[PDB]
Amino acid sequence: XXAXXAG
Amino acid sequence: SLSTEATAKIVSEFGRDANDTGSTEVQVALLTAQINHLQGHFAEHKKDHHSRRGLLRMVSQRRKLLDYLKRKDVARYTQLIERLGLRR
Amino acid sequence: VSMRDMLKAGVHFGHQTRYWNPKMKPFIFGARNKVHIINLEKTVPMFNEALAELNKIASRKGKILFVGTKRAASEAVKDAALSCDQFFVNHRWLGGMLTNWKTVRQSIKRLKDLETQSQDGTFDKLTKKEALMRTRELEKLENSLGGIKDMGGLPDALFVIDADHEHIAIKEANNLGIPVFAIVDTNSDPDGVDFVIPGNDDAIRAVTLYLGAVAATVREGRSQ
Amino acid sequence: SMQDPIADMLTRIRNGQAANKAAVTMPSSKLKVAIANVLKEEGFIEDFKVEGDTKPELELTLKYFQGKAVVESIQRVSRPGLRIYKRKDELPKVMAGLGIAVVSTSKGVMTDRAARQAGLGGEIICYVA
RNA sequence: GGCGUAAAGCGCACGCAGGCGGUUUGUUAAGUCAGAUGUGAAAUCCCCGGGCUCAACCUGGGAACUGCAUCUGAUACUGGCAAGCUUGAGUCUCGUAGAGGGGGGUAGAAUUCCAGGUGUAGCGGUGAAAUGCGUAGAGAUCUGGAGGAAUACCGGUGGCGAAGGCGGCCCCCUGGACGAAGACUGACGCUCAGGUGCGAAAGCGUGGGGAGCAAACAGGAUUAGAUACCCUGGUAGUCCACGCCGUAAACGAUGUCGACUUGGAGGUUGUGCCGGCGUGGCUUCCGGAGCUAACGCGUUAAGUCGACCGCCUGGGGA
RNA sequence: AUGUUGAUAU
Ligand SMILES: [K+]
Ligand SMILES: [Mg+2]
Ligand SMILES: [Mg+2]
Ligand SMILES: [Mg+2]
Ligand SMILES: [Mg+2]
Ligand SMILES: [Mg+2]
Ligand SMILES: [Mg+2]
Ligand SMILES: [Mg+2]
Ligand SMILES: [Mg+2]
Ligand SMILES: [Mg+2]
Ligand SMILES: [Mg+2]
Ligand SMILES: [Mg+2]
Ligand SMILES: [Mg+2]
Ligand SMILES: [Mg+2]
Ligand SMILES: [Mg+2]
Ligand SMILES: [Mg+2]
Ligand SMILES: [Mg+2]
Ligand SMILES: [Mg+2]
Ligand SMILES: [Mg+2]
Ligand SMILES: [Mg+2]
Ligand SMILES: [Mg+2]
Ligand SMILES: [Mg+2]
């Protein structure tokens, strides 16, 4: 998830 | 297996000589003796499947020798199956 | 060469039968005490025609190269080569001595440069340690490239003790189409070798016999 | 079981050549001997000889030239699983005539050269080259 | 053209049809081969020409139509028929090793439970715990008893079996393999679609049995959660009889049979000659040529060949 | 003991 990454 | 004595009796009965062990008639007669002997074993030992594979080899071998004898000499075949008491 | 010399020298003794190469079946007489006996009746004729062609190459002013790096057969090979005025490799064969001669040539020049430096008294100029390095650097180059320092190019034939042990030299000699003459014991493979000499490669007494003969025949070639 | 003795002879030669054997020994037969003649006459093998009465043994002596074996290839062509018969016009040239096809014609076993000359076709036994 | 690992060897066998078939002689002439004759419409294609200004196009003659049939010969090979032969295959004699199979019996070690003695506060369990067990006396220790299941050591890249598989000891019934000497039969063989049989474990049916173990399940943990791994329990099942199922990475991921082609080191089981020297069977590891995309395989081939069968044809969908 | 994950194209 997170509504779509790596930071 | 068939005993030394019982083997020798069949060799004399079916052989042209006492030393004629090879003949198709002797071979077929010996197989028939052991196939008939083992009927008692497999009546008792229905799940002796490993031994039965040996029985069905004898049955097969005998069929091949009778099919040989028949086409080689029809009369010798007809005499043999009568004595031993085989359908074919 | 004589056959009484061979059986005296112990040329007939091969390796244990378990260590044999099957391609040496033609040259093997039999087995005594689980050790292959080389047939000397094969050796002597084969060694004569080996000694014949070496003489022929010698007579054409050919550079013979005596390769044999086994501990026992080292100083034998150098004595035979120097007595004959020919070249040798009596310690570790450098991979690419012949096939990479263009490179190895440069390491000859170093051995030549260091010895000319040594005798001049160039080592006294540098500060002890620097000279002691050069002393050690000369020493290692003498061991490796000492026998072929004056060779000047590729040799005209190889003479080899132990075809298995010196398989790299032979494979290089095959690569460049240089004739290989070799002592081939029962454990060894004769296929690279151009003139097989079925014999005991191990014993010093056997080694001296072969080397003495090739030394003689090549020296006799250089005479005539 | 053994069901092609000719293929077996060709294979004994092929293998024997590869193994640098001097001679190869098979059980003999008339047809094997007939082939051995054609291989002798065309110069692929050196010699042969039958030995025995009850069980005859053919024994081909093999040729090597400059180290190499002389029989470069030797292929069964007609075989029990598929018989090949050719008419005179359609006889095979092995290696553009540099090798032979052994042909069983009505006038005995012979090369495809000899069969062309005799005007016969027949069963193509093998190629040799 | 492929099928050890890329897709591909049926799990294994027996075997009918079929395919294939050691060696010698004769015979036949079906296959096969040779020749001849008839036919193979014309056009088309092809070749050498001719005609339209050229070409396309048109057209003369040939060649071709690889085929089919008939007749007459050839007889090596294949087939048929007849008679052989012993080398393939099989029979007999004597012996050898074996967890080969089926049936019955029995032994010792251990677990669990039951009863009782001694004894007293823990036991058990884990990474750490807790659930659990225990003063109603556990755990530990000793005695006696019951019952089921499996057979330590021997034990071995040991053995046996078609494969699946088979392990205490004893007996009964029984299959195969191997070796040595001959003698005997005389190709009786190989392979095998369909067919038939056997086929681990799990599972199913009926009736037994049930110590230990353990899907499910329950509880305790762990964790963000933990429908898991760990812990405490625990039912089917695992065991027996009979029947069914018919599948497994049922594997050497390698079909069966036969022949041939350098070596080395073992294991196991016969045997001959006198600890050595041979010679058979089965088997483990390495490796040569050769083979292979390579890895590797390598006389137990994945090398060199023959016979027959099975199977593959991009990934997915399946 | 346990001990998850890393948007699309390039
Ligand atoms: K998520
Ligand atoms: Mg029997
Ligand atoms: Mg392909
Ligand atoms: Mg795969
Ligand atoms: Mg695959
Ligand atoms: Mg298989
Ligand atoms: Mg079968
Ligand atoms: Mg035949
Ligand atoms: Mg005909
Ligand atoms: Mg014109
Ligand atoms: Mg025309
Ligand atoms: Mg026409
Ligand atoms: Mg015939
Ligand atoms: Mg089937
Ligand atoms: Mg079960
Ligand atoms: Mg049940
Ligand atoms: Mg029940
Ligand atoms: Mg549990
Ligand atoms: Mg399957
Ligand atoms: Mg498989
Ligand atoms: Mg290997
Ligand atoms: Mg991740």
Side-chain angles (χ1 to χ4, degrees), chain C residues 128-179:
Chain C
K128 186 267 192 290
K129 293 263 64 173
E130 298 293 341
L132 196 75
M133 282 203 312
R134 287 171 180 290
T135 298
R136 196 182 192 109
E137 188 173 359
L138 204 161
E139 190 272 347
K140 61 153 282 187
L141 288 179
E142 195 67 58
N143 294 8
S144 58
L145 293 172
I148 63 169
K149 65 194 289 293
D150 304 300
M151 182 154 75
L154 286 170
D156 296 73
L158 263 73
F159 187 69
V160 175
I161 313 305
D162 199 314
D164 260 8
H165 191 100
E166 309 291 356
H167 66 272
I168 295 170
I170 291 170
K171 191 162 176 286
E172 285 186 63
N174 298 348
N175 189 285
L176 301 176
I178 298 167

Side-chain angles (χ1 to χ4, degrees), chain C residues 60-190:
Chain C
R60 201 159 45 249
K61 302 291 146 284
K63 302 178 288 182
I64 311 308
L65 180 62
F66 292 63
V67 181
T69 66
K70 294 190 292 90
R71 179 70 71 70
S74 291
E75 67 280 5
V77 155
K78 89 183 305 308
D79 292 352
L82 289 175
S83 63
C84 196
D85 307 352
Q86 292 293 183
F87 317 103
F88 58 98
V89 174
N90 83 125
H91 303 126
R92 167 179 140 69
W93 175 273
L94 306 186
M97 230 153 197
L98 308 176
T99 58
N100 188 207
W101 168 260
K102 51 270 216 179
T103 303
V104 175
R105 195 199 308 165
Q106 299 167 12
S107 192
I108 305 297
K109 191 180 184 295
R110 185 59 179 174
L111 180 61
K112 278 174 158 53
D113 285 7
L114 287 174
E115 68 186 55
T116 49
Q117 280 176 9
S118 183
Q119 299 293 345
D120 186 61
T122 310
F123 288 9
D124 298 5
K125 279 65 265 181
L126 312 109
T127 59
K128 186 267 192 290
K129 293 263 64 173
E130 298 293 341
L132 196 75
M133 282 203 312
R134 287 171 180 290
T135 298
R136 196 182 192 109
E137 188 173 359
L138 204 161
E139 190 272 347
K140 61 153 282 187
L141 288 179
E142 195 67 58
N143 294 8
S144 58
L145 293 172
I148 63 169
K149 65 194 289 293
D150 304 300
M151 182 154 75
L154 286 170
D156 296 73
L158 263 73
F159 187 69
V160 175
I161 313 305
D162 199 314
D164 260 8
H165 191 100
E166 309 291 356
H167 66 272
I168 295 170
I170 291 170
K171 191 162 176 286
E172 285 186 63
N174 298 348
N175 189 285
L176 301 176
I178 298 167
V180 174
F181 304 77
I183 312 309
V184 186
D185 203 343
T186 56
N187 69 344
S188 189
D189 169 48

Side-chain angles (χ1 to χ4, degrees), chain B residues 23-86:
Chain B
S23 54
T24 305
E25 286 81 347
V26 163
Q27 287 196 65
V28 166
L30 284 172
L31 292 176
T32 296
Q34 189 53 216
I35 288 167
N36 289 356
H37 174 70
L38 288 171
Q39 297 307 130
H41 172 82
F42 288 105
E44 183 171 357
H45 300 290
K46 296 191 182 69
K47 318 309 183 293
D48 185 4
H49 291 308
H50 286 58
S51 296
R52 190 178 282 112
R53 195 169 102 105
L55 174 65
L56 296 165
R57 183 173 143 184
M58 296 165 203
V59 167
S60 292
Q61 186 168 308
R62 185 176 68 180
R63 184 65 275 165
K64 281 167 174 174
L65 289 169
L66 285 171
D67 291 350
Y68 173 67
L69 187 63
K70 182 176 169 66
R71 69 185 166 68
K72 161 143 280 187
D73 190 290
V74 184
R76 279 167 60 200
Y77 163 78
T78 300
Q79 291 159 210
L80 182 61
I81 65 170
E82 176 51 53
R83 285 179 66 185
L84 298 171
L86 311 178

Side-chain angles (χ1 to χ4, degrees), chain D residues 31-90:
Chain D
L31 180 57
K32 283 177 195 179
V33 166
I35 294 155
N37 279 289
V38 173
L39 301 180
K40 191 173 175 170
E41 83 194 6
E42 293 304 317
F44 287 111
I45 65 164
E46 179 46 52
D47 176 68
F48 71 93
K49 41 161 285 189
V50 189
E51 288 294 344
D53 39 56
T54 314
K55 281 82 61 55
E57 291 285 300
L58 181 60
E59 188 261 11
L60 312 188
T61 296
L62 302 180
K63 291 179 65 172
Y64 304 82
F65 189 41
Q66 311 301 68
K68 300 155 68 73
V70 172
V71 179
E72 183 168 285
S73 57
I74 179 165
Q75 318 170 15
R76 194 70 164 113
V77 168
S78 184
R79 53 184 180 72
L82 173 59
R83 298 288 182 180
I84 308 295
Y85 310 101
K86 294 297 193 193
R87 291 184 289 197
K88 66 166 266 62
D89 56 306
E90 301 167 357

Side-chain angles (χ1 to χ4, degrees), chain C residues 202-223:
Chain C
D202 304 296
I204 183 59
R205 190 167 49 243
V207 163
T208 48
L209 188 153
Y210 316 124
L211 285 172
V214 298
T217 207
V218 170
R219 183 164 53 248
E220 285 285 359
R222 291 189 87 70
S223 298

